[PDB]
Amino acid sequence: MLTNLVAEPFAKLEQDFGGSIGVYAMDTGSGATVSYRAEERFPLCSSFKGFLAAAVLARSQQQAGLLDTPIRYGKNALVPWSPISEKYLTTGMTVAELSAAAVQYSDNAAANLLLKELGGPAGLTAFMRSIGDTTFRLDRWELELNSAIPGDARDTSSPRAVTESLQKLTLGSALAAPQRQQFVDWLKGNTTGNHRIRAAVPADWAVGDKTGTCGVYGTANDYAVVWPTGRAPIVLAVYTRAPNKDDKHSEAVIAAAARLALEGLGVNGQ
Ligand SMILES: O=C(O)c1c(F)ccc2c1O[B-](O)(O)[C@@H]1C[C@H]21
Ligand SMILES: *[B@@]1([O])OC2=C([C]=[C]C(F)=C2C([O])=O)[C]2[C][C]21
Numbered sequence: 511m512l513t514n515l516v517a518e519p520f521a522k523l524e525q526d527f528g529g530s531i532g533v534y535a536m537d538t539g540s541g542a543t544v545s546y547r548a549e550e551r552f553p554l555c556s557s558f559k560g561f562l563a564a565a566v567l568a569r570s571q572q573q574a575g576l577l578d579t580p581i582r583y584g585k586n587a588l589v590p591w592s593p594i595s596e597k598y599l600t601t602g603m604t605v606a607e608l609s610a611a612a613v614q615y616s617d618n619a620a621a622n623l624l625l626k627e628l629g630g631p632a633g634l635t636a637f638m639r640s641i642g643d644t645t646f647r648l649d650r651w652e653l654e655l656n657s658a659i660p661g662d663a664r665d666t667s668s669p670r671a672v673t674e675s676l677q678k679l680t681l682g683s684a685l686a687a688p689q690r691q692q693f694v695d696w697l698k699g700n701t702t703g704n705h706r707i708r709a710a711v712p713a714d715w716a717v718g719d720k721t722g723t724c725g726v727y728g729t730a731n732d733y734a735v736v737w738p739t740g741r742a743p744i745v746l747a748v749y750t751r752a753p754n755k756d757d758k759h760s761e762a763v764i765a766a767a768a769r770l771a772l773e774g775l776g777v778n779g780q
Contacts (some may be wrong), residue, residue: 512542518770520546527763529728529752534669535771538681539742544774551645551666552749553658553729555722556616558634558648558665560733562624563609563696564679565637567689569628570605577606581623589652592619613696613720618652625651631665638675641684645671658729660753672733672747680718680735681743694718697735705761706732707748710768712780715739723759728752730759732768738777746771 524531532547570576582602588595594611595603603611608624611617628634631648638646649655649664678684680694697718711717719734733747748767750759772779
């Protein structure tokens, strides 16, 4: 009833990109939605790291002092793309610092260390099940989870399930109020998303996001909570893939899809 009240040229955009774009956007005030390939599976890539940090925060509600726990790690933990954890190899970092690094710099070593804390990919999957997400699945660790093989459901979710879970965690009751705001604050401080959803969001609106980039099969993504001034927040997810292993991803296509989603919701932007 409230889905796709205004059609947008997502098909033309994905054809120009040479792949598939999946979009789900939710106006949390009216419940209106924009939906395009929203129930197809796309590889999570690093976008799982936001939900990873939420799962850690959930655990911290029952474990006072979890976030402050210092974690030492060896050089064998430092897999490629670990920009924060490599600078603290000789000192260690706290669980909260590892969570912030995973969210804000997509730190791979931090993500693997936190996955171990939660009981591995099945433990993160169990957390997502506990909030009502039956679509999300994490199956592997960094870096193997980025393979993005066409048709492979491992390490995927759907744009719709990503948006629904993000809403529950950032705006709903899935986390206690202090942990909810900490999750929002980590997302707001993300440094890797300036050319994706944020490029579609006016500078005077608050926004938090988590990006993902698999490095193959034109596969990259971003999800965000957006607070336009004077109205209810918007939650949205934009995922891409492409048929060939050497197909490149496009940040511009993600930003353009985000623009179309906001336009489809009637949210006046840039
Ligand atoms: O490795 C990084 O990407 C990185 C980081 F994650 C946090 C801070 C810095 C980094 O590198 B740089 O831009 O050369 C600079 C000292 C600053
Ligand atoms: B992950 O998918 O996140 C990521 C990587 C490399 C470059 C990026 F821009 C991103 C991202 O989008 O956050 C590697 C670590 C993984």
